[PDB]
């Protein structure tokens, strides 16, 4: 119990010249008594300058409390000092728990509070650990493991290899993830084969949202006003999947947030300072998809009013057996209809009921 005012007297003595080990003793105390000594652990100065357990105790005590305003600021100050004393400290930090506390502290509504100096020192520590781009890839992978989509964009803006490794994208779609994360990943670089495997995985665990988000890059050409789902072996079709692929002019663009961009910009600044110091979709290709039946499409679904403007519907090399009549009467602008290499057994007479059929195959 008396160790509290003892450490207070030590803090009183830290200002006298030539204070020199004393680090080990107070380290053992802070390891023993968690709460009150940590509030006074700011007395920790540059001592020892390489025990990984020291930084481990530091960051574990930080995240263990993580809810008293000024003690986290003091800890960040001490951390900045130590990393200024040694750059190898960075690797150890990212190794032990650094991300686990940084993300939790800056995602917990860090903005909307008059903590300008807090965010400044925090982004300084960010830019400081931003070196050693391998550690940046590690930070990206760990931020993607967590469902923390707020700083994946920040990590990408600073420059991060989304193809670092089983790539990142397949890992993201393997777990129940958020659309913003997969969208930010797909916008940045991504190997087409990796995106393909990701689509296979997401097909295995049906999720219309991420499926549409993937198809919005894999098989959509806004220029040609066409969909090019040719040979993706997608065992079926769902109108919800192609839902967000059609224009839907009622949708618009709105900047939901910019905090990630501001963050990235300010960490880039701190790093620089430290270095110095109509138009419908008129084509829909579904060839070689190994389909079995195309009745999910139409049925008065969302896609049903975005098919009346279709002017070409290729369906070759699949495995169909029949063509639903409601699909025909809905498709009121088809001109080219390709059904070759399917498995049909008798000609449906009503295929000629369409308004503008001109090339039946």
Residues 6+ apart with CB under 8 A from 338: 287, 313, 314, 315, 316, 361
What's the closest the beta carbon of residue 71 comes to another protein, in angstroms? 33
Given the complex with another protein, which of 53 and 165 has the nearer CB atom?
165
What whole-number distance in Å separates Cα of residue 166 and Cα of residue 185?
15
What's the closest the beta carbon of residue 257 comes to another protein, in angstroms? 13
Given the complex with another protein, which of 55 and 154 has the nearer CB atom?
154
Given the complex with another protein, which of 43 and 230 has the nearer CB atom?
230
What whole-number distance in Å separates Cα of residue 309 and Cα of residue 330?
10
Given the complex with another protein, which of 98 and 246 has the nearer CB atom?
246
Given the complex with another protein, which of 189 and 235 has the nearer CB atom?
189
Residues 6+ apart with CB under 8 A from 163: 189, 190, 191, 194
Given the complex with another protein, which of 15 and 255 has the nearer CB atom?
255
Given the complex with another protein, which of 252 and 345 has the nearer CB atom?
252
What's the closest the beta carbon of residue 221 comes to another protein, in angstroms? 6
What's the closest the beta carbon of residue 265 comes to another protein, in angstroms? 7
Q: Which residues bind another protein (CB under 8 A)?
A: 157, 189, 191-193, 219, 221, 223-224, 226, 228, 230, 261, 264-265, 268, 285
Q: What angle is formed at CA 105 by the lines to CA 190 and CA 7, rounded to 5 degrees?
A: 140
The closest alpha carbon to 146, from 155, 159, 158, belongs to 155
What's the closest the beta carbon of residue 107 comes to another protein, in angstroms? 21
- Tokens representing 227 are 């969909």
What's the closest the beta carbon of residue 278 comes to another protein, in angstroms? 9
* Breaks in the chain listed by the residue before each, with C–N > 2.5 Å: 20, 49, 165, 277
Helices (H), 97-207: 98-107, 116-129, 133-145, 152-157, 168-174, 179-187, 192-204
What's the closest the beta carbon of residue 134 comes to another protein, in angstroms? 19
Given the complex with another protein, which of 272 and 302 has the nearer CB atom?
272
3-state secondary structure of 256: coil
Given the complex with another protein, which of 38 and 314 has the nearer CB atom?
314
Sign of the CA dihedral with 279 first, then 283, 284, and 288 last: negative
What's the closest the beta carbon of residue 273 comes to another protein, in angstroms? 14
What Cα–Cα distance (Å) separates residue 159 from each residue in 99, 135, 179? 17, 12, 21
Residues 6+ apart with CB under 8 A from 114: none
What's the closest the beta carbon of residue 194 comes to another protein, in angstroms? 11
Half-sphere exposure of 42 (CA within 13 A, CB side): 12
- Tokens representing 216 are 């919005």
- Tokens representing 163 are 């193809």
């Amino acid at each position: 119990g008396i160790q509290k005012c003892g450490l207070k007297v030590i803090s009183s003595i830290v200002h006298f010249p030539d204070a020199l080990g004393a680090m080990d003793s107070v380290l053992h105390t802070l390891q023993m008594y968690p709460d009150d000594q940590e509030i006074q652990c700011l007395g920790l100065s540059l001592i020892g300058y390489t025990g990984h357990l020291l930084a481990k105790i530091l960051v574990s005590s930080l995240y263990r409390f993580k809810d008293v305003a000024e003690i986290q600021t003091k800890g960040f100050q001490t951390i900045l000092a130590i990393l200024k004393l040694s750059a190898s400290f960075s690797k150890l930090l990212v190794h032990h728990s650094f991300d686990l506390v940084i993300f939790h502290q800056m995602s917990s509504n860090i903005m909307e509070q008059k903590d300008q100096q807090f965010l400044n020192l925090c982004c300084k520590c960010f830019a400081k650990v931003a070196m050693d781009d391998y550690l940046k890839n590690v930070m990206l992978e760990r931020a993607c493991d967590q469902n923390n989509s707020i700083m994946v964009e920040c990590l990408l803006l600073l420059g991060a290899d989304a193809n670092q490794a089983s790539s990142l994208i397949c890992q993201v779609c393997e777990k129940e993830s958020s659309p913003k994360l997969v969208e930010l990943l797909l916008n940045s670089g991504s190997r087409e084969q990796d995106v393909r495997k990701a689509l296979t995985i997401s097909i295995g665990k049906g999720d219309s949202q991420i499926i549409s988000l993937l198809l919005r890059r894999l098989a959509l050409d806004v220029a040609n006003n066409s969909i090019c789902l040719g040979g993706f072996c997608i065992g079926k079709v769902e109108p919800s999947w192609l839902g967000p692929l059609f224009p839907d002019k009622t949708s618009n663009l709105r900047k939901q947030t910019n905090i990630a961009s501001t963050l990235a910009r300010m960490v880039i600044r701190y790093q620089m300072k430290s270095a110095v110091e109509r138009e419908y979709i008129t084509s829909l290709d579904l060839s070689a998809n190994e389909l079995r039946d195309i009745d999910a499409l139409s049925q008065k679904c969302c896609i049903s009013v975005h098919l009346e403007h279709l002017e070409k519907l290729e369906l070759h090399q699949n495995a169909l057996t029949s063509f639903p009549q409601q699909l025909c009467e809905t498709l009121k602008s088809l001109t080219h209809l390709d059904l070759h290499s399917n498995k049909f057994t008798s000609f449906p007479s009503y295929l000629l009921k369409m308004s503008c059929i001109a090339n039946l195959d």
